[PDB]
Design a protein around this ligand. Structure first.
Ligand SMILES: NS(=O)(=O)c1ccc(NC(=O)c2ccc([N+](=O)[O-])cc2Cl)cc1
Ligand SMILES: [Zn+2]
Length: 257
């Protein structure tokens, strides 16, 4: 099945998922000088005070942490969005080396990793229905650079030892994803897709300009995870990013000048 290798990786995904060559695929290179400053964009509202984290899951592609999204908690609104979008999960994409790992790039610059906070449009009732809609999801993307540690990341780093392998999960409550957010909520936004299969064109992307800093030690711990299941040959969970895709018709908007 699909993955990140030479024979099944991003260049192969179009065979099982033909939308891979569609008109609104993600990620993209963010050309900061062709992006349009839009003073009409309402500020972004990220309201995570009541986010109830539940569990962290290793799925064979990344580690997904899923939230209890059964109540009106942990919502993204404003910015380019109409209505309210509810947090369901976050995950990361990262590299084998500090010089790559991000999915979006900024004037061709690759960051060490990228965090995706995934939210579904509450007008569609749940995540599974929302992904079938053109405005179903809003993904908040945040770049990671290697420097000072991010203290709010450490609780995630420490649990990774227990989910080394595909299909392992651990209880993970009371985690404040506010600890993963940079100072500024300045952003770029554009219409796109999931960056893994099924590659559905259901996402309003909101990519923050300001990266967070994490330590080398923190990202090194991401790189100890495995793609393979327990009792299969060891293949380290690294370079789980899709490269930039063609922008095609699209415009990227900026919330700042
Ligand atoms: N990398 S990204 O664009 O943020 C992104 C990519 C893929 C997803 N996928 C999911 O959330 C997902 C999880 C489970 C299932 N399922 O039915 O088993 C389906 C999806 Cl679409 C979410 C976000
Ligand atoms: Zn992602």
């Amino acid at each position: 099945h699909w993955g990140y290798g030479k024979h099944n990786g991003p260049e192969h995904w179009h065979k099982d998922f033909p939308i891979a060559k569609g008109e609104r695929q993600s990620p993209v290179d963010i050309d900061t000088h062709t992006a349009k400053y839009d003073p009409s964009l309402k500020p972004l509202s990220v309201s995570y005070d009541q986010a109830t984290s539940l569990r962290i899951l290793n799925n064979g592609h990344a580690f997904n942490v899923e939230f209890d999204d059964s109540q009106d908690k942990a919502v993204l609104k404003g910015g380019p969005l109409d209505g309210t979008y509810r947090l369901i999960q976050f995950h990361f994409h990262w590299g084998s080396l500090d010089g790559q790992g991000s999915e979006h790039t900024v004037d061709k610059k690759k960051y060490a990793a990228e965090l995706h906070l995934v939210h579904w449009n509450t007008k569609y009732g749940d995540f599974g229905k929302a992904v079938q809609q053109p405005d179903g999801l809003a993904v908040l993307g945040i770049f990671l650079k290697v420097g000072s540690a991010k203290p709010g990341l450490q609780k995630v780093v420490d649990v990774l030892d227990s989910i080394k392998t595909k299909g392992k999960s651990a209880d993970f409550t009371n985690f404040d994803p506010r600890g993963l957010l940079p100072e500024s909520l300045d952003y770029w936004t554009y219409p796109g897709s999931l960056t893994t299969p099924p590659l559905l064109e259901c996402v309003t992307w909101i990519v923050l300009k300001e990266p967070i800093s994490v330590s080398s030690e923190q990202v090194l711990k991401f790189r100890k995870l495995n793609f393979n299941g327990e009792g299969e040959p060891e293949e380290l969970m690294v370079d789980n990013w899709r490269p930039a895709q063609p922008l095609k018709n699209r415009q990227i908007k900026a919330s700042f000048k």
